[PDB]
Every structure is written in structure tokens, then in C-alpha cells.
Amino acid sequence: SALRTGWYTSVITIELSNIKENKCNGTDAKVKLIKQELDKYKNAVTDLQLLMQSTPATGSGSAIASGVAVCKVLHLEGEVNKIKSALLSTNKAVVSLSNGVSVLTFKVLDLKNYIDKQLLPILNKQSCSIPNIETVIEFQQKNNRLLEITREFSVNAGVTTPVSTYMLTNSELLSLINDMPITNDQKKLMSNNVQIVRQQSYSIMCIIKEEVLAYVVQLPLYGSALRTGWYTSVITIELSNIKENKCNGTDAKVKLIKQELDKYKNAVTDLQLLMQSTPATGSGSAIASGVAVCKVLHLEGEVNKIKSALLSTNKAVVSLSNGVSVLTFKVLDLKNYIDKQLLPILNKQSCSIPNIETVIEFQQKNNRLLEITREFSVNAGVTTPVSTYMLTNSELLSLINDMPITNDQKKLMSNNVQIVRQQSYSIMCIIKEEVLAYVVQLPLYG
Amino acid sequence: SALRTGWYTSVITIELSNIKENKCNGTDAKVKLIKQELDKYKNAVTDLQLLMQSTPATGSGSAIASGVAVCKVLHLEGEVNKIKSALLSTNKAVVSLSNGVSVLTFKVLDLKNYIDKQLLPILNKQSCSIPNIETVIEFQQKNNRLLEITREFSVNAGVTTPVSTYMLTNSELLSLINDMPITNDQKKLMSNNVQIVRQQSYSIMCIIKEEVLAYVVQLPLYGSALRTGWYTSVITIELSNIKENKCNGTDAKVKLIKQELDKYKNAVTDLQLLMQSTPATGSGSAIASGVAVCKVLHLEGEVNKIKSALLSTNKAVVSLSNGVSVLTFKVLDLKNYIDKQLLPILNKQSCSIPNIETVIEFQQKNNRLLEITREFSVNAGVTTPVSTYMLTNSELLSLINDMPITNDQKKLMSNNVQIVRQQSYSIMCIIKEEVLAYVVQLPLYG
Structure with a gap:
């Protein structure tokens, strides 16, 4: 499978x-x-x-x-x-x-x-x-x-x-x-x-x-029903555009934050390099639906349209210039955390010593980005089953309750989350204007 | 007989x-x-x-x-x-x-x-x-x-x-x-x-x-039933084109690989010399069917056609420029083993010391080629019965289920594998573009 x-x-x-x-x-x-x-x-x-x-x-x-x-x-x-x-x-x-x-x-x-x-x-x-x-x-x-x-x-x-x-x-x-x-x-x-x-x-x-x-x-x-179609959603991670700030880092608490920041920058560049090397898929590929949606996200102002829609919420319906409406998610906001919560504490000239709990929190937030990057890297940007790092249990249940299906099918999928993940794909799409987007492609049984 | x-x-x-x-x-x-x-x-x-x-x-x-x-x-x-x-x-x-x-x-x-x-x-x-x-x-x-x-x-x-x-x-x-x-x-x-x-x-x-x-x-x-005709298949061995790489070989583990590589090259050249010396057969020869198929393999691009068909599978049906469809086998892939598994470990400049288990594995893979070469050499390129080195028990059973015969004849041949081998011939055909091909000719009793 x-x-x-x-x-x-x-x-x-x-x-x-x-x-x-x-x-x-x-x-x-x-x-x-x-x-x-x-x-x-x-x-x-x-x-x-x-x-x-x-x-x-x-x-x-x-x-x-x-x-x-x-x-x-x-x-x-x-x-x-x-x-x-x-x-x-x-x-x-x-x-x-x-x-x-x-x-x-x-x-x-x-x-x-x-x-x-x-x-x-x-x-x-x-x-x-x-x-x-x-x-x-x-x-x-x-x-x-x-x-x-x-x-x-x-x-x-x-x-x-x-x-x-x-x-x-x-x-x-x-x-x-x-x-x-x-x-x-x-x-x-x-x-x-x-x-x-x-x-x-x-x-x-x-x-x-x-x-x-x-x-x-x-x-x-x-390399239990009939899947009659595919459902594609856009999952976004908010990125912080920051170039390296090599200040006076003496103690280990400052050094740990800079190591985590380097982990963050490496993942973005690794994902950037990964997408510039993806081969092509055919119309008979199982992920043709997602790939087609990805290419639509490369149209003018589509990332900005999704970014504005996700400014004050974690999930929104966006109508693309394609004419199709697509459900978009914001699962991780590293733009807000790094720029508004981490950098102000550390920066102002030479790196202020951060709290040890602060190093912990940044590590946990950045980990999901690193794990997503790792999963994409070892599978050439297409992963299946969809891991909980790609889409948490809470997010996946939220997505199911928005699909164009009857209420019975929603309860059917909600009780079989593991099965749903194994029939689904996660496809890395784009990094553009401080937004990391991948498309998750779920089965439709009706 | x-x-x-x-x-x-x-x-x-x-x-x-x-x-x-x-x-x-x-x-x-x-x-x-x-x-x-x-x-x-x-x-x-x-x-x-x-x-x-x-x-x-x-x-x-x-x-x-x-x-x-x-x-x-x-x-x-x-x-x-x-x-x-x-x-x-x-x-x-x-x-x-x-x-x-x-x-x-x-x-x-x-x-x-x-x-x-x-x-x-x-x-x-x-x-x-x-x-x-x-x-x-x-x-x-x-x-x-x-x-x-x-x-x-x-x-x-x-x-x-x-x-x-x-x-x-x-x-x-x-x-x-x-x-x-x-x-x-x-x-x-x-x-x-x-x-x-x-x-x-x-x-x-x-x-x-x-x-x-x-x-x-x-x-x-x-020098059981009536054989009403002949069935010919093409059996291929994938060859690696490599000229001698005399690097610094000091220990016996490197020396053994180079002896086995010399065994490999000698077998190809021995088979090449063997084919340039074969006498001709008549229309009344029992291997006229196989020989006629061998010559068809000498038509333009036939070996490339079989090579492509057998790139990602071990067995395929190929339509020749003759217009006749023939069943082809890939029984040994030395091109992939030597070029992608053996040479990368050893080569990079001076010969790296190989694992002793590596020397074992190369000997077993090359042994079949040497035995096939030996059998062809002492019989002027035509052997009968078809030894298990020409065609293993698994391969012969695989072929029988693809023949244009009724299901009853398929069980009849499968339960009498030894008899089938004795009525069959193996005919060395060609070495061309990293492909070793010999035609195997089985009886038809219908």
C-alpha cells in the first residue's frame, strides 16, 4: 500500500x-x-x-x-x-x-x-x-x-x-x-x-x-470501500525570513538557540533544494490531483491570498484564481514565534542570555518543521502514510469535518483515522514569501 | 539420445x-x-x-x-x-x-x-x-x-x-x-x-x-507423445563492459576479486571466439528453429529492444522486426552487480580491500556464467539436455506457463521437467551491447 x-x-x-x-x-x-x-x-x-x-x-x-x-x-x-x-x-x-x-x-x-x-x-x-x-x-x-x-x-x-x-x-x-x-x-x-x-x-x-x-x-x-475520488487541502507553515545574526554568544544557552536557528535555516534551504529537483508525475500518477493543486499555488498572488486568509485564523476556505475553492490550514506559526517572541528576547545588540525554558520551547516548536523536512527529503517530496507531523490528529479530524461528504462518512473517517492516513499523500508544494505549503490528498469513498 | x-x-x-x-x-x-x-x-x-x-x-x-x-x-x-x-x-x-x-x-x-x-x-x-x-x-x-x-x-x-x-x-x-x-x-x-x-x-x-x-x-x-513443433525463447545475461583496472592489489582479498574479474572477461571473450567459429546447420537440423531465431536477433536494434524490455523486469514478451513475438528472460544481471555493487566498493583509485563475504558473493554470481560458457565451449555452442545452469528449475517452470499450450499440457510438462530438458536445446546466439543471449528450444506435443 x-x-x-x-x-x-x-x-x-x-x-x-x-x-x-x-x-x-x-x-x-x-x-x-x-x-x-x-x-x-x-x-x-x-x-x-x-x-x-x-x-x-x-x-x-x-x-x-x-x-x-x-x-x-x-x-x-x-x-x-x-x-x-x-x-x-x-x-x-x-x-x-x-x-x-x-x-x-x-x-x-x-x-x-x-x-x-x-x-x-x-x-x-x-x-x-x-x-x-x-x-x-x-x-x-x-x-x-x-x-x-x-x-x-x-x-x-x-x-x-x-x-x-x-x-x-x-x-x-x-x-x-x-x-x-x-x-x-x-x-x-x-x-x-x-x-x-x-x-x-x-x-x-x-x-x-x-x-x-x-x-x-x-x-x-x-515500487473498507471504493475510493471514488480525491480531496486536496493546503497545509501551511508560517516562516520567518531572517539572515544569520552572529552576535557575542558566550554561554551554552545562547549557543543552543543559534544551533536551533541554524537547524531552522537549513530545513528551509533543504526543502528549497528538494523542490528544485523533483521529477515529474503523469496523469496516471496517484498524486496527480495534489500536484495539479500545487502548480495552481504557483499562480500570481495565490500564496498572498492564502497568507491573508490565515492571518487571524488557523484554517480558512480560499477561492483560487483557478476558480476552485480549497481548504487551507496554518499548522505552525514560526514567523510569529521567532520574530515576535524569540528574537526580541535575544536580540537588541549582542545576544542576551536566554532562559533555559526558552531554549526548550524553541526546540519543540522547530522540531515539527525539521521532522516534516526529514520526511520529505528521504521520499523526494511525497510521503505516505501521512504522518502525525504532517497533520496532527486534531488537525486531521478538523479537516474531515469540512469535507464535502455526508455526516455518516465523517464519522466513518473519524473512527478510522489510521486507515485514512494510509490512503492519503502529503506533497511538498512551495516555499514563497515566508510561507511553507504542502498539499495533503485524502480519499473520497462516495 | x-x-x-x-x-x-x-x-x-x-x-x-x-x-x-x-x-x-x-x-x-x-x-x-x-x-x-x-x-x-x-x-x-x-x-x-x-x-x-x-x-x-x-x-x-x-x-x-x-x-x-x-x-x-x-x-x-x-x-x-x-x-x-x-x-x-x-x-x-x-x-x-x-x-x-x-x-x-x-x-x-x-x-x-x-x-x-x-x-x-x-x-x-x-x-x-x-x-x-x-x-x-x-x-x-x-x-x-x-x-x-x-x-x-x-x-x-x-x-x-x-x-x-x-x-x-x-x-x-x-x-x-x-x-x-x-x-x-x-x-x-x-x-x-x-x-x-x-x-x-x-x-x-x-x-x-x-x-x-x-x-x-x-x-x-x-553422432510419451509426438513432438509436433518447437518453441523458442531468448535467455539473456546482462554483461558489464569493463576494461582491466590494474590498481594496487596487495592482499589476497583484492587479488581474489581480480582473478574473478579475469574469469569474467575470459568467459565473454571465449564465447565471442566460440561464435565466430560455429559451423552451419541445415534446414533438416533439429535446431533450425533456434538458429533462425538467433539470426533474427542480429537484425538492427533487436538487442536494444530486448535490453529495454528487460530493464525493470526479468521476463518480457518482445515483438521482433521479424513480426514474431518471442519470450525473453533475464536470468543473470552482471551489469548491475559489477557496475553498481562491486566496482563502487573496490574502486575509487587504488583498490579498496573488499570484505571476504563480498568475494564469496561475486564468485557465486559469476559461477553460472562460467559454467554456461564451459558447457557451450565443449559442445560448439549447442547443448542438450538443457542444464540447470542454462535454465534453472524456477525459470523453466516460469517459461512453461507462458507457452501457447493448454493448461493440461502445462501440468504435463511441469511434472516432467527432466524429460523436457532432454528434448530441449540451448543455442548460443550473440554477445552485443552488453547483452549475452542464447536461445532455448523446447518441444511442442500438441
Whole structure:
């Protein structure tokens, strides 16, 4: 979860038999149990077709946006026939779509061949030839996977997670993992944590067309509801612009303050250097929403707009020149502390000796800045899970109670703060005009 | 077996009697047992004729492609008569086909002469003259070989292996061996292992035409199912291009690394020299598929294509400029180990003393390359069976699940890994742009 960098999607197909109503005289129980099982198969196909007419829409911020994008490509002309041909003699193939993208495809259940080549010919040797009870067991167990897959998709609007063994067996999941574009150690990692892999993966019903039932399974690439979007907030630390004041520092109490002041200046310059070296992200990056907001903060006067709004409060709604309103926070005011509370005590010429409790207080205030700087530095400006240094428990609960969600979702997030932090990102944005700003990107499940 | 270099084919003929329905009054049992035996003979001929109308097609990669090629030559004008004339007064003759190829032919059963000249004249001394019970046994045993040959071909689609004693007796097989174009010691080799020779040979029903039943037996030339084709994969080792760095090496730990580095460089140059000396193979060579793929790897930018595909993953499918998609493996990354893990520790000017565990680790990583190089060197760049150094157990299982074969064949190969290795070849291909590539060629039984 914390090291996932992308999504991997595969096409999972079930071969269907094109058989209409076969109403021949069925008297005994074995012929009826077969017919009642064929109705289950047919009702399962029509249930999924009916389910795919009410399919909810998905946005760019959805966790399954990539898997949904793959499903729509399967609706291009001849894609189903292309996959059908590639799986005629194999259970697994790589198919180059007309999108130009190569996708891994699976044939997990050949009900087309069982019904047409094995079940019906036995039944069609008489007036519904009385089959062996063993055959009734055999057809019943084969159809079970389709019925359970249909049941899962029906009670979950065609999107399920975790991915059950009916959607993808352990053998099929392992074969998929071994065919992923990851290193050998990553394939060992996922193969030893298939249960976690299932919990972090989605299975999306896609299409039924030309005797092919297909759903896409979406897996994580490493480097309880559906996340339907992202929520971005601006978190600000008020900075004090001060150049080094080398006065007469004799005792250790003055020296400690100057060491802490040097810690403060180093963190700002380290964060400045860090941002001048960040690589770029793609539209498919999980932090595209936050990165887009960061760049908006670089527009004219946006930092000043946020600074004025946070002058007399710790949290405000600011309407950006983007036209979007964003919630902004002020979590730490080092501008006010250093300039109005610390420097006046020390400075006036040569450094006045500070109180020992004063050295303590400055250390505690500056620590959160240093810890934030350290977390950003070792992760190239993007951290997850969002640490309590990035956003304290009090601040995070305050942010939740301002999100555009129903009251039930607010209590849902408030009781699962640890989970919320693990689905969220903190993205360093900018240092400009005595303001340190980073964007925290939280999940939306509605 | 790991020594077969070609195939030897021979034409085996059974002389057939052209007799239609002979419905004369048969009252007693001895006349009825003769007539019931003549029906078995006639049903056997029509069974084989019907069998040869459903004969499956064969490709150039088939293990019986050469034998199948010989059968079709027997369909040329006058070939059967040429073979019939050559076997009028002897059981074995060399015949120069209109193909220009000499083939060894056998007459193993003269049912034409027995029925026409000995059985029928006895029966045609009356209204189906009552024959002696001895004659009933004699005809019954003579017809038995034809019936058993017919049974084997019928339940095996006209191709059987191992070659039974009915297809070719021990006396006939030994005669064939001494007429092969091999050495006296090779003849002694096969004559002491006729059971193995039978297990590695094929019998192929060819034709029934002009009173001649002909099948071709295909034997190996030394230097479970039928192999219908070949599957080729590309196995890569990532090389580090480094010229000798003779720095101050005093202790034995530095000296050991430099010996191992010299082992590394010698292996590359030995393999380079080995490829510049390989002889050519023919279209009838068992490794023609692999060789053709090797040459495709010499097309512009193919090695770069595979190198990029294997930058962040150990296995990938690559579409060549040939238009054919091939599965590529990265089994050893010495480029990353030497350049990023070993040289940084040692180098910086004069060789830094390495940890003794470091010297251990380099030796184990380089050992596989040296063993692969050694195996290629002593076999002129083609090895079989494919040793575990060419392809480990993990890697071979990984490959099998990617082959274009049904799930049943994947389990069949996975449970018979040793057998798969013995039917496979490893062919050194190329060293180019820091990449060592050899093609591995596996059987296809479908």
C-alpha cells in the first residue's frame, strides 16, 4: 500500500455457450436437475447483462479508473474476437489491443466447450437422454464458479474487492503475478502475500459479447470501500525570513538557540533544494490531483491570498484564481514565534542570555518543521502514510469535518483515522514569501 | 539420445492379395474359420485406407517431418512398382526414387503369395475344399501381424512409437541397423540397445496401392507423445563492459576479486571466439528453429529492444522486426552487480580491500556464467539436455506457463521437467551491447 506506484490490469474471460431454450420432455429427476442447472447458467448471463446497464460512472480520481479504461477498450471492434482467437488453444495469452496496448488475458472457464461438446451431446442422444448422476455433479460444479462470480458482481454493482478465489484462483493469481512487468523480488513479494494482494486488488465486470464473458482484474504495482475520488487541502507553515545574526554568544544557552536557528535555516534551504529537483508525475500518477493543486499555488498572488486568509485564523476556505475553492490550514506559526517572541528576547545588540525554558520551547516548536523536512527529503517530496507531523490528529479530524461528504462518512473517517492516513499523500508544494505549503490528498469513498 | 544428429527412414512393405468376395457354399467350421479370417484381412485393408483419409497434417517442426516427407515421395508415379519389382526375389533392396534419393526397402509379409498361391488353390480344389486344421492355423498366424499392425495404426492415427516387434521384428530391425550409413561402432551401439532404439523411433503408415501396403519406419542417427513443433525463447545475461583496472592489489582479498574479474572477461571473450567459429546447420537440423531465431536477433536494434524490455523486469514478451513475438528472460544481471555493487566498493583509485563475504558473493554470481560458457565451449555452442545452469528449475517452470499450450499440457510438462530438458536445446546466439543471449528450444506435443 505504501510502496504502490501504479496499477496492473488483466482480462479474465469465461467462454459461454450460445444455447436457447431446450424444452424436451423431462420426466425423471436427473434430466430436471440438468435443466434447472441450465436455467441457472442462463439467468446468470442475463443478470450480468442487466447489471451492466446500471453500471455507475467513474471519474479520473477513481481507484478503478484504469481498469474501467481497459474495459471500454474491450468494446472496440474485433477486440473480443482477438482475445477469443488467442485463447482457442491456450488458457493465457498476451493480446495487443487496437489501442496499441498489450494486455494479459486468461481463459479460466470454458463453459462453451463443456455444454456444447460434452453436456448436450449426452443429453441429445435421446429425448434428453437420462444422464449419469456423475454428469449432473460435474455440470453443477462447473457452473458454480459462474454463479458465484455473478452473485459477487450483483451484490457489489459489478466491482468487487478483495478479489475472491472465484474471480481469480491462487493458481491463476500466481500465474498472473509471474507475468507482471516487475522484478523477480517483487514477484516473490506478491507471491508470499497473495491475501494482501487480493485485498488491494479490484475485479471489474466488463462485457458479455460473442460468447465471451470478460471481467478485468486490477492489481497494484509496488515500487473498507471504493475510493471514488480525491480531496486536496493546503497545509501551511508560517516562516520567518531572517539572515544569520552572529552576535557575542558566550554561554551554552545562547549557543543552543543559534544551533536551533541554524537547524531552522537549513530545513528551509533543504526543502528549497528538494523542490528544485523533483521529477515529474503523469496523469496516471496517484498524486496527480495534489500536484495539479500545487502548480495552481504557483499562480500570481495565490500564496498572498492564502497568507491573508490565515492571518487571524488557523484554517480558512480560499477561492483560487483557478476558480476552485480549497481548504487551507496554518499548522505552525514560526514567523510569529521567532520574530515576535524569540528574537526580541535575544536580540537588541549582542545576544542576551536566554532562559533555559526558552531554549526548550524553541526546540519543540522547530522540531515539527525539521521532522516534516526529514520526511520529505528521504521520499523526494511525497510521503505516505501521512504522518502525525504532517497533520496532527486534531488537525486531521478538523479537516474531515469540512469535507464535502455526508455526516455518516465523517464519522466513518473519524473512527478510522489510521486507515485514512494510509490512503492519503502529503506533497511538498512551495516555499514563497515566508510561507511553507504542502498539499495533503485524502480519499473520497462516495 | 542426447547424441542424435539426424533421422534415418526406411520403407516397409506388406504384399497384399487382390481378392474380392469369394462366397462359395461354406457349411463346416474349417471353411468358416478360413472365410472369417479372409474378412479380417479385407476389413484390415479397408480400415487402413479409411485411416489414411483422416491423416493429420505435419509441420516442418514435427519429429516425423522427414518420414512424412518420404511417404509423399512414394506417391510419385511408378514408385510403388519400382519397390515391388525390387522385392520380387528378395526381402530387402535399395531403391533409387524418382526423388534421386536412395531408400532401404523391406518386404516383411507376403500375403499376396500366401493367399493367391497356397491358401486359395487348396480351397479352390472343390466348393471351398475343406482344408486341414493345420492350414487354418497357418493362415491365422500369418494374418495376425497385419491385424496387429492395423490395430496399432488405428488407435494412434497412423503413427506409432515405440516401434513394436510387429512393425519391425528384432531380426528386421538388426538388418536395418547394419544397412545404415553409420560406423561399425554405432551399429554395435544400436544392436546392444534395440529397446532404446525402438523407443526413439517412429512407424508411419504411408500408402496402400497396387497390392502393396507400405509404412515408413523412422530411426535416429547418433553422432510419451509426438513432438509436433518447437518453441523458442531468448535467455539473456546482462554483461558489464569493463576494461582491466590494474590498481594496487596487495592482499589476497583484492587479488581474489581480480582473478574473478579475469574469469569474467575470459568467459565473454571465449564465447565471442566460440561464435565466430560455429559451423552451419541445415534446414533438416533439429535446431533450425533456434538458429533462425538467433539470426533474427542480429537484425538492427533487436538487442536494444530486448535490453529495454528487460530493464525493470526479468521476463518480457518482445515483438521482433521479424513480426514474431518471442519470450525473453533475464536470468543473470552482471551489469548491475559489477557496475553498481562491486566496482563502487573496490574502486575509487587504488583498490579498496573488499570484505571476504563480498568475494564469496561475486564468485557465486559469476559461477553460472562460467559454467554456461564451459558447457557451450565443449559442445560448439549447442547443448542438450538443457542444464540447470542454462535454465534453472524456477525459470523453466516460469517459461512453461507462458507457452501457447493448454493448461493440461502445462501440468504435463511441469511434472516432467527432466524429460523436457532432454528434448530441449540451448543455442548460443550473440554477445552485443552488453547483452549475452542464447536461445532455448523446447518441444511442442500438441
